[PDB]
Ligand binder design. Sequence first.
Ligand SMILES: Nc1ncnc2c1ncn2[C@@H]1O[C@H](COP(=O)(O)OP(=O)(O)O)[C@@H](O)[C@H]1O
Ligand SMILES: O=S(=O)(O)C[C@H](O)CN1CCN(CCO)CC1
Ligand SMILES: OC[C@H]1O[C@H](O)[C@H](O)[C@@H](O)[C@@H]1O
Length: 476
Amino acid sequence: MQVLHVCSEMFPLLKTGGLADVIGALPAAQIADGVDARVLLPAFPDIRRGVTDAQVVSRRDTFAGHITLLFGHYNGVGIYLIDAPHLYDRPGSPYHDTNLFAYTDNVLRFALLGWVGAEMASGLDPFWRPDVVHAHDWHAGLAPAYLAARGRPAKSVFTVHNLAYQGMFYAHHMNDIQLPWSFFNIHGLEFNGQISFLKAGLYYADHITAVSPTYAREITEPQFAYGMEGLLQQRHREGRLSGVLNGVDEKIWSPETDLLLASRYTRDTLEDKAENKRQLQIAMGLKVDDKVPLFAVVSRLTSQKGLDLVLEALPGLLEQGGQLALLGAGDPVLQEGFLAAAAEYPGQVGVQIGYHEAFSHRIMGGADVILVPSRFAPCGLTQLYGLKYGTLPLVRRTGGLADTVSDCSLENLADGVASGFVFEDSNAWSLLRAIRRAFVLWSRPSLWRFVQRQAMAMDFSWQVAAKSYRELYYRL
Ligand SMILES: Nc1ncnc2c1ncn2[C@@H]1O[C@H](COP(=O)(O)OP(=O)(O)O)[C@@H](O)[C@H]1O
Ligand SMILES: O=S(=O)(O)C[C@H](O)CN1CCN(CCO)CC1
Ligand SMILES: OC[C@H]1O[C@H](O)[C@H](O)[C@@H](O)[C@@H]1O
């Protein structure tokens, strides 16, 4: 079984969010579980520079101009790169320019991604051809469309990491992407009178997965599907929709071995976490106090993630004696809002606007609670990281958050399954109740410790995930 992942990011080479973490860890897990998995990425600068053994496989002309297909390895996994400098040789985000504007040629940049994914199924690489093309999110959404147009020389799965990103392009671009014009149909990649790459992936794939069992349910609903629910309901009925929960990469996210930490620690030596908290408080200008709960945010600052709710609840949190350590970027209103709170409440509110990989680890290893009040959450990796680091996740019950966190209810505590705090509704009052629950648990140190150790006992294994994907690939 040979599988090609088609995607736009991969940790540690290029990352804007959780998708990169997944691509950086799944393929190796699949190889251990007996599937020959390879990865296809655009040759973005940071990616090309990481793959130092990359060699030329072939050269082609395409509707978007020439590509050189390269192939190398990273961390033992086979990596293909689409070198097409006129499309991909630009710094920063795969998706937008430095002024945050989508590239005007995005339609070509990502259509080509899909095209090369499909072409691989027809011998683009004379030495290796995938049995399954595994496309991720809209970026790779055309892979299954090109495959369908070519008579399906390989089977395909399309994995939804997030349905809110639809890859919408004007219909006239049908002229530019070398697909049958008959594909521009509601039974095809048309969506509200435009081309949707997401629609294309959902429609043409042999099978669709989502990154958690609950999200796979949710996206058959209008409030999570944003118009796509009819296709997904039909695919569910056809048995062509399923959920497979993400793992966590233990090479990167383990307090036991995390080299980015002032102090490493384990489920049975949580006293060794204290130094991380102390240094986190110092680094952020917080009062150095071990009697007070430190709440953490590592997140995009947006409504999708519920960070407006955090801002609204902040006074309530401060009033009860908690601290906040926040790292993130997003809505300028929220950025400014949080900077204002840090200025207004120095010593209890520490804020850092921007993206900092290493600092996220120091927050994860030092905070007591991580706030993940997502409005929707296909998976929510930061919360799985919280569990592993014994920093209790405080989450809204939606998507993967609902699959993985157990509220500190009486029965969960009694059954020894409690592992964090869960609230229900997307408002500050609802959030504030969970926050109060955390203060109540904090006032009982031995119960807190009990819950920390259960949080750290939870396991999210990529090789277990690989086994589900394998079963799926063989059913296709
Ligand atoms: N400002 C930031 N600094 C460092 N890492 C961040 C920042 N914002 C998000 N991340 C990281 O991005 C990933 C987000 O994954 P996840 O929580 O599943 O959300 P999503 O898939 O929507 O990006 C996590 O690794 C998280 O730690
Ligand atoms: O907004 S864009 O469509 O231009 C950019 C992408 O959709 C960015 N992503 C990456 C993957 N995501 C979810 C999986 O981590 C968030 C959307
Ligand atoms: O965060 C970026 C945005 O992405 C999507 O468009 C969501 O619909 C929105 O809620 C979110 O804030």
